Amino acid sequence: LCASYEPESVNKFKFGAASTLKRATFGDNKALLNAALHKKSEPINDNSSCHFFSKVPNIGTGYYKYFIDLGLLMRM
């Protein structure tokens, strides 16, 4: 609540950088309209935005990106 320069309540998003899908999932009916007015371009890094686009959240095992090293398969 005191992560910005002023105490912020649990009802609104005033200073914290919250995405439009986070504000719409929290409950704000004019969130996408205000994002369309101000032409907002937001990255998808939160749970409410990851569940919309069927992305794995950045929580727990989804905190890391996983690759496969095809070197040992191509070597033999």
Binding site: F53, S54, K55, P57, T61, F67, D69
Partner: protein, 95 residues
């Protein structure tokens, strides 16, 4: 991964859906060719990216388009990354 597989649509209900990177809506297959009608009427030929989202996500985006809000998705053309070997690290204390 558990909550991802729960909240997303079933693996049996999969179909190749393409989205337009310029205007944001679902591409169409006219007679085998993935086209965007809005951009072929506007004399463009933009990128079409395959997406794997839920059907309710597409219904929500199309209804927000019907309200007038254009929703345009951008995709990660990530630079190709290479695994390099790392040195040995021992985290045991020294007594």
């Amino acid at each position: 991964n558990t909550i991802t597989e729960v909240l997303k649509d079933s693996e049996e209900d999969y179909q190749d859906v393409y989205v337009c990177e310029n205007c944001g809506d679902i591409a169409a297959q006219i007679k085998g060719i993935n086209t965007c009608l809005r951009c072929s009427k506007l004399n463009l030929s933009p990128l079409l990216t395959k997406i794997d989202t839920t059907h309710v996500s597409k219904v929500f985006l199309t209804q927000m388009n019907a309200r007038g809000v254009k929703v345009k998705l951008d995709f990660e053309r990530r630079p190709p990354s290479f695994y390099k070997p790392l040195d040995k690290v021992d985290l045991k204390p020294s007594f």
